[PDB]
Design a binder for this molecule. Structure first.
Ligand SMILES: [Mg+2]
Ligand SMILES: [Mg+2]
Ligand SMILES: [Mg+2]
Ligand SMILES: [Mg+2]
Lengths: 63, 225, 136, 386
RNA sequence: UGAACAGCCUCUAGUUGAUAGAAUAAUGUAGAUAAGGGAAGUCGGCAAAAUAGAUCCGUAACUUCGGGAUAAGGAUUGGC
RNA sequence: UCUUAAGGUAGCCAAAUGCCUCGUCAUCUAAUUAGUGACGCGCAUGAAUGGAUUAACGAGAUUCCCACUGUCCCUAUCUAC
RNA sequence: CAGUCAAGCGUUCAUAGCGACAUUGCUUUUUGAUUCUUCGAUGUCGGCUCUUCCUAUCAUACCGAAGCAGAAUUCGGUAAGCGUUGGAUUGUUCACCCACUAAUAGGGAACGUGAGCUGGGUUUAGACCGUCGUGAGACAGGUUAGUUUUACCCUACUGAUGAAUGUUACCGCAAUAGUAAUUGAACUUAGUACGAGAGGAACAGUUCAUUCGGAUAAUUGGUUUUUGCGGCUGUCUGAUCA
RNA sequence: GGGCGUGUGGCGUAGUCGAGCGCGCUCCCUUGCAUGGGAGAGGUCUCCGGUUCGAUUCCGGACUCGUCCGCCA
């Protein structure tokens, strides 16, 4: 199997878990759950959502 | 020979197969006649690999191949990649491509020396083609057809292009590729010639509905005699 | 589907009933396709015949070129936008409903496809896979 | 006049009446057909339904488009402690059917099985099988005359077995007792096997093994009184309907001047005993083993229990059966797993199955992690961890 | 608060009256939400949804020249 | 030319007025006994029995389009009583 | 709707398929005829919903015949097990087109079904037009608007208890009753059999799908009084916190 | 749906079993408020079968058109 990464939060996606979304510019996004999927559809920036890997990498928290 | 073959009724052989000088690739869900054509014509000198690319029977439109290298999309699994690495000779290089257009047989029309690509490919993918295949690259369209792999059939000796192609585009592409090109049809008039057939230096395989003048044009332009 | 099927297809969750309007992905000059029928659909009282990805439908061009309007023609669904499950269990969906025009044998009226197509459609129709830019 | 448009009948008439089951343990109405050549073995087993999870396996179907490719499938887990054999019974065959003639019990009966014979256990002198154990502890006098009676008569031998409810996280303390048919050897060999196995435990791998197609017999989940729209699946009446719309409009013609039995009406939904056939065993797990949830490809030592335990059930410290798909009944319910009544080839019942990965994430939410070590490695250190 | 004797909350004053207790089946009455499609339902878009204040831009055919007109159609709005 | 008091003028129409009739042609739709525009030997239109036209207005009747939605595919769930 | 006879049609040949002139029947899903029951009232069109029955079988199963070479088709037998659709117009039944499908067969059950719905039509009282009438008014002529009541009783049906079989508990047997699965596509057989060619099968095998049914909730989606967490408006608790 | 009748040249129209006239225009001759005259072309008699010797004609079938009567309370 392959363990994919969340396109919004960077969480690990196990097989059969979450959803996938193909945008009209032929780019693939993978969501581990409906929470990150809905934040993506609400167009929030993952650099400003405090629990994401990209936020913690930006803010040097636990790095 | 332009060999008459069908893929279970399908007269498009370039979709389901990829033929180079050094190797051949065929789909796993194929008929005995379809395998027997490549086995009889190619012989034991050239390996024939039954493969699946990205879980799809279509392999010719998914992959772009050369005698020096093979390009596979990102969606190709590790089991398929390892099976191709074991089955293929050590000379060829297999490298995954991470690019949005992702259907390399449609995107890329290539031979041993020179290649035509889709105009809008990424620069890293162009450099990856030039590295792995060792092939000089041009970004060009065939009379406004961006899918140069589907709308051109190319070999070392010559090339077949789209029938509704401007003549000025024909000498421009011929001078750019350093091979003679003929506008013609395959499979009783189907426009998609690269999807219609596969060709290499000594063999061309086409659909059963490809007519005799079309087959004569094929053997004339590819010098298979 | 029916006649021009290259193999079989696993059941995809039906997302396009009769009366649905989808975008027309090819370069044939039509803008949208209006689904009036699904090939191979069964019969149940009050149930609408619905289409999924890779299905062949009967459609009319509601908006587009006048030589394409006001007649019925076959079409092939290439983008679904209703989420469906594969046998590797990913749930996936596009962001719009989209199809292309074809004859009853399945070869495309147009020549190029804009945007992605599904692999369940590209495996089933080789001409769509021939003119398709990206297959996911 | 005739019905204007034809449509199939709503519901199945062969599952009637849709009433509550007589007991919470469903009855095994038929056992596999005996042949007197195989060794003496049980025909079924008892367990408790624990819950469901997913696996990933490589499909082997030579001709499918998903041949030699990974698929993810839903399996359900049945917790099966080793069952305890107390008692055998023999059945003679009469022109009015099968009839039991004697029952010979084991000597020492545990408290969890003799709680089955009581409604008020806490106020009792616990006098059960006391004079029967007094019939024992002689040499043999009142014992092998009944055993030789079962040998001389009794064309069908069944074994009384009972679960070990105290090994499970259930708070019941009162075991389930059942009859399981023996399907090997002669009548004398059957009763000799039973006599040797009195007061002894039989494990689940002695009766089941991998890639075996089995049947699940259980009582379904109860739902109480239900209207006709969800109980039978009839069409909802339109919005502007006076006096309600979750109904059936015409419940019969003028003649015959009675409501027919075939008309869908409201009543009890669920809690019916069902037998679902052809479920393939993917794993016969051992409880005396770590890395139950590990495969040859995963190879991380984790048990089959998810993070936080199975929801509403608990732990799987005993042996278990991983079986493909859905079985009737909800969690914490007794379920009888039975061998197949026929030999199925089908090129699907003969498929050899080797698992690749088993899901052990939490079912009490959107679990991200399979093991607490993986969760700690991903999240780093926290405030509570010093 | 707000344009406002609108709606919502509060002060003075006045009530705390309307058989109650326990559970939460079906079918109701009243209030709601729904993936994908979007009137395919129906005699008929019945019912519901959508729109909504204010500022700026822009506004057709026709006309009894007064209108149509908030036509249509766009953009903005908090706190400091 | 006969008959009659005089023979339907200007206009309008399958109109809320046309039996035949689901009139014929065009348009609208994949498909229209619906709608609209024309045609007129009009069973049985027609001039203060008022005729024709008409801006604005209408809890009036009818057709189409955009938006919108559990009206529907196909049902599910929640709250109060 | 079905027979009998057979002058003829069918290149030739009554009966493969038809069949004139005649003649024997069946059915009560047509419309009549009659007036037996009901006028101290049996709710009156169509649709929606739902069950069952009939066979005079549209499809599916197995067969017989051909003016059956193959493919397609036609006639007939056992057969009602199983299915028989989505729409535009019209209040319609009916009809007529579009389209899918294996097929879109015909009917009954107080012209099934209004204390099941609806109320478009018809069929009150308002109103308009045309024709008729001096007039009041008339018109299976056209148009528009027009209150659809009650079950808590008995039976039936769906589910639920329960006295009495010395008491109580556990494990069982099985009389009887019900019953369920259905249809298609693709690959291959095979461009094979057959045929002069055009054309072009079938059995076995494999992978899927349609309709139906019984469960189930690992995953995905829906639902939110977990009023669980966060945010936001207005007001009130002097502010802050809450 | 059924009944009854109908079908001729480019147009209209005459036909007892043995396709003519008029109108359109082809040409020629002949004339302001533009005529007339003379020779022209023009049919598978709606179609298909039988009778006859030969059917526009008689008969049978089909197509087409025009009339008349027909659903419910
Ligand atoms: Mg309906
Ligand atoms: Mg009826
Ligand atoms: Mg019927
Ligand atoms: Mg859960």
């Amino acid at each position: 199997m392959k363990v994919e990464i969340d396109s919004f939060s960077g969480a690990k996606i196990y097989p059969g878990r979450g959803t996938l979304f193909v945008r009209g510019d032929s780019k693939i996004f993978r969501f581990q759950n409906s929470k990150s999927a809905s934040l993506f559809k609400q167009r929030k920036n993952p650099r400003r959502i405090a629990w994401t890997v990209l936020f913690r990498k930006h803010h040097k928290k636990g790095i | 020979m332009a060999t008459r073959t069908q893929f279970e009724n399908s007269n498009e052989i370039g979709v389901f197969s990829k033929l180079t000088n050094t190797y051949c690739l065929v789909a796993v869900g194929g008929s005995e006649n379809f395998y027997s054509a490549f086995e009889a014509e190619l012989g034991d000198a050239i390996p024939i690999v039954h493969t699946t690319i990205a879980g799809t029977r279509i392999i010719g439109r998914m992959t772009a191949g050369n005698r020096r290298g093979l390009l596979v999309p990102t969606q190709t699994t590790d089991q398929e990649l390892q099976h191709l690495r074991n089955s293929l000779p050590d000379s060829v290089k297999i490298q995954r491509v991470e690019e949005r257009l992702s259907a390399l047989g449609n995107v890329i029309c290539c031979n041993d020396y020179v290649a035509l690509v889709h105009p809008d490919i990424d620069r890293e993918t162009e450099e990856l083609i030039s590295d792995v295949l060792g092939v000089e690259v041009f970004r060009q369209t065939i009379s406004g057809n961006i899918l140069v792999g589907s709308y051109c059939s190319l070999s070392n000796q010559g090339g077949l292009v789209h029938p509704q192609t401007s003549v000025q585009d024909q000498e421009e592409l011929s001078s750019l590729l350093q091979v003679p090109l003929v506008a013609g049809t395959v499979n009783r008039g189907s426009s998609v010639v690269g999807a219609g057939m596969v060709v290499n230096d000594y063999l061309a395989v086409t659909g059963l509905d490809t007519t005799a003048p079309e087959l004569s044009v094929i053997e004339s332009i590819f010098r298979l005699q | 589907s029916g006649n021009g099927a290259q193999g079989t297809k696993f059941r995809i969750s039906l997302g396009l009933p009769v009366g649905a309007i989808m975008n027309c992905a090819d370069n044939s000059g039509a803008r949208n396709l209006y689904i009036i029928a699904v090939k191979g659909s069964g019969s149940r009282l009050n149930r609408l015949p619905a289409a999924s990805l890779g299905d062949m439908v009967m459609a009319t061009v509601k908006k587009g070129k006048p030589e394409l309007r006001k007649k019925v023609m076959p079409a092939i669904v290439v983008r679904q936008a209703k989420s469906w499950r594969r046998r590797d269990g990913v749930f996936l969906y596009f962001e719009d409903n989209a199809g292309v025009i074809a004859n009853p044998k399945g070869e495309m009226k147009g020549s190029a496809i804009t945007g992605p197509v599904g692999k369940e459609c590209a495996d089933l129709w080789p001409r769509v896979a021939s003119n398709s830019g990206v297959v996911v | 006049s005739h019905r204007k448009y034809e449509a199939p009948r709503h519901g199945h008439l062969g599952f009637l009446p849709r009433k509550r089951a007589a007991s919470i343990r469903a009855r095994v109405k038929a056992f596999p057909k005996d042949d007197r050549s195989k060794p003496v073995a049980l025909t079924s087993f008892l367990g408790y339904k624990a819950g469901m999870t997913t696996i990933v396996r490589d499909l082997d179907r030579p001709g499918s488009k998903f041949h030699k490719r990974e698929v993810v499938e839903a399996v359900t887990v049945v917790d099966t402690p080793p069952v305890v054999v107390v008692g055998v019974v023999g059945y003679v065959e009469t022109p009015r059917g099968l009839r039991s003639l004697t029952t010979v019990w084991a000597e020492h009966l545990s408290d969890e099985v003799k709680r089955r014979f009581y409604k008020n256990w806490y106020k009792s002198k616990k006098k059960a099988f006391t004079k029967y154990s007094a019939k024992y502890a002689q040499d043999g006098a009142g014992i092998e005359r009944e055993l030789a009676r079962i040998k001389k008569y009794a064309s069908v031998v069944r074994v009384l077995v009972h679960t070990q409810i105290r090994k499970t996280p259930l708070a019941q303390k009162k075991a389930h007792l059942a009859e399981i048919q023996l399907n090997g050897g002669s009548i004398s060999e059957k009763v000799d096997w039973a006599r040797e196995h009195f007061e002894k435990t039989v494990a689940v791998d002695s009766v089941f093994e991998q890639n075996e197609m089995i049947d699940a017999i259980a009582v379904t989940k109860g739902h109480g009184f239900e209207g006709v729209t969800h109980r039978w699946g009839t069409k909802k009446l339109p919005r502007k309907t006076h006096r309600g719309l979750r109904k059936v409009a015409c419940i019969g013609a003028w003649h015959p001047a009675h409501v027919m039995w075939s008309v869908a009406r409201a009543g009890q939904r669920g809690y019916h005993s069902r037998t679902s056939i052809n479920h393939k065993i993917y794993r016969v797990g051992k409880g005396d083993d770590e890395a139950n949830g590990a495969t040859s490809f995963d190879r991380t030592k984790k048990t089959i229990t998810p993070m936080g335990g199975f929801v509403h059930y608990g732990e799987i410290k005993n042996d278990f059966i991983m079986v493909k798909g859905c079985i009737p009944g909800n969690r914490k319910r007794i379920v009888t797993l039975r061998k197949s009544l026929y030999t199925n080839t089908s090129r699907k019942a003969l498929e050899e199955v080797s698992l690749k990965w088993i899901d052990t994430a939490s079912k009490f939410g959107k679990g991200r992690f399979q093991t607490p070590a993986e969760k700690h490695a991903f999240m780093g250190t926290l405030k509570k961890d010093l």
